[PDB]
Amino acid sequence: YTYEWVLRKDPNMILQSSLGNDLRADGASIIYNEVNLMANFMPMDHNTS
Amino acid sequence: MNLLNAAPTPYVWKYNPVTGKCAGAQQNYGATIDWVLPGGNSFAYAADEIRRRFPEPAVTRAITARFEAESDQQPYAGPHETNIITADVVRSGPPPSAVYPFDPSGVQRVQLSGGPEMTPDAFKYYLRVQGPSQEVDEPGVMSQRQFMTTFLPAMVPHPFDSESPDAFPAYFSSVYKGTNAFE
Amino acid sequence: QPGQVLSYKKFLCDNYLWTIPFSSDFMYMGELTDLGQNPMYTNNSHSMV
Amino acid sequence: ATPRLQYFHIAGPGTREYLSEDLQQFISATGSYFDLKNKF
Amino acid sequence: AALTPDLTTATPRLQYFHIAGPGTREYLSEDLQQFISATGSYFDLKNKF
Amino acid sequence: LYHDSGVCSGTLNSERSGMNVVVELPDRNTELSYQYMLADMMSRHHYFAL
């Protein structure tokens, strides 16, 4: 399967302030380096899986 | 009761997985009941009955083989594994349905970028399925499960009394005397 | 400057007593665990380190 | 299945299958004021 | 055993590359020609042969 | 109370079977066992002065 998604970079969306001020006008920014997808697989019996 | 007639603790074996040779046997102290100081006459009989109800080595062999059969990780491919090993060899190499041009012109062939013989899937799978050139296992070394089928834990009453068997901790008998050796 | 700051990720876990279950899937399937009665430990002596 | 585990109910039939039926009736009847269910 | 001779059809190069071949009306499978004729008002496939 | 001390352990036994039925293991922990049992049986923020 392919599972493509997109991450928000808007400071006002992704971040929450205790004052509600405009973070874009207040110098908030984010840089994504490595966004990996983890997964847990039950090692259930291949015969029974 | 009499402790001379009491059933002894079984000897469990040590496998030594890396060399593969048996590492010896030990008195099965790791699973023992504490029955003489707290138990007394009521539990001495119970402990004896538990000890003599230890399965005989044939029964333990059958139980272990049955446990191993339900593994799903047998050494050779079952229908699940062999089906996918056939599936990937089928979809490997040049496709059979690809109608490509064979140009036997000694001047002015085609470029044929692509992506006049072919190998059949029977031989193609035969290459993938065949085993080694040995086809016989070396003596002494055994895998864990083949060691568990043999070398079974068993009660050994009066072991150090016979004519010339003693035991197998770690040795190599040489001169008709049991030489527990390799020091 | 952002190059003059660090990060110091750390955790505290009091009263926990780290537990590793002797089970194949690391989950609870009974007090007598999955590998507890596997006749590869029960019948053969192993010297763990 | 191992006999020494069944003797100590580590792998035995279970409280419902080894207690005498009269004792089970007793501990069920007197289960709200004199609990005996934690002793087996 | 090792390699089979494999099927051959022995078509001339000029006909194989349709440089001097039969013609589009008579080498495309009749169902494909019907498909092109039907859906040729919005999906041009006559330039691909 | 001296728990899990083989040198200074307790004693419980009957009269016909005067042999002691309680052998204490220094390698078990009775105190922490009770702590875990009581924390599992009830929340630990309750104060029971008895």
Q: Is D1 in contact with C32 (Cβ distance < 8 A)? A: no
SS3 B90: helix
SS3 D25: helix
What resolution in Å is listed for this PDB structure? 3.4
Which chain B residues contact residue D4 at CB under 8 A? Answer: 31, 33, 50
For chain D, report the end-to-end CA distance as a whole number of angstroms.
18
Inter-residue contact B62 to B44 (CB < 8 Å): no
Q: Roughly what angle, to the nearest 10 degrees, separates helices B79-90 and B121-129?
A: 130
CA closest to C24 among chain A residues: A43
In the block, tokens 């007793």 appear at: D26
- Ramachandran quadrant class, B4 (left: phi over 0; alpha: psi -120 to 50; beta: rest): alpha
Non-local (6+) Cβ contacts of C3 within 8 A are none
What value does the CA radius of gyration of chain D take, rounded to a whole number of Å?
A: 12
- What method was applied to determine this entry? cryo-EM
Q: Is B31 in contact with C44 (Cβ distance < 8 A)? A: no
Q: Is C32 in contact with D2 (Cβ distance < 8 A)? A: no
Which chain F residues contact residue B38 at CB under 8 A? Answer: 19-23
Which two tokens mark E42? 């919005």
Inter-residue contact E25 to E33 (CB < 8 Å): yes
SS3 C44: strand
Q: Which amino acid is at E20?
A: A
Distances (CA, A) of B64 to A12, B17, B28, B67: 63, 17, 18, 5
Q: Which chains touch E (3 or more CB pairs under 8 A)?
A: B
Q: Are 3 or more Cβ–Cβ pairs between D and F shorter than 8 Å?
A: no
Q: Is B37 in contact with F23 (Cβ distance < 8 A)? A: yes
- Give Cα F6 distance to the centre of its chain: 13
Q: Looking at the complex, does the CB of residue A27 fall below 8 Å from at least one CB of chain C?
A: no
In the block, tokens 């009847």 appear at: D29
Non-local (6+) Cβ contacts of B100 within 8 A are B112, B114
Q: Is C32 in contact with D5 (Cβ distance < 8 A)? A: yes
The residue length of chain F stands at 50
Inter-residue contact B157 to B48 (CB < 8 Å): no
DSSP secondary structure string for all residues of chain A:
----------HHHH---SS---TTTTT------------------TTT-
Using a CB–CB cut-off of 8 Å, the residues of B that contact D are 31, 33, 46, 49-50, 53-54
Which chain D residues contact residue C32 at CB under 8 A? Answer: 5, 10-11
Inter-residue contact B125 to B119 (CB < 8 Å): no
CA closest to A44 among chain C residues: C25
Which two tokens mark A46? 């291949």
Inter-residue contact D19 to D40 (CB < 8 Å): yes
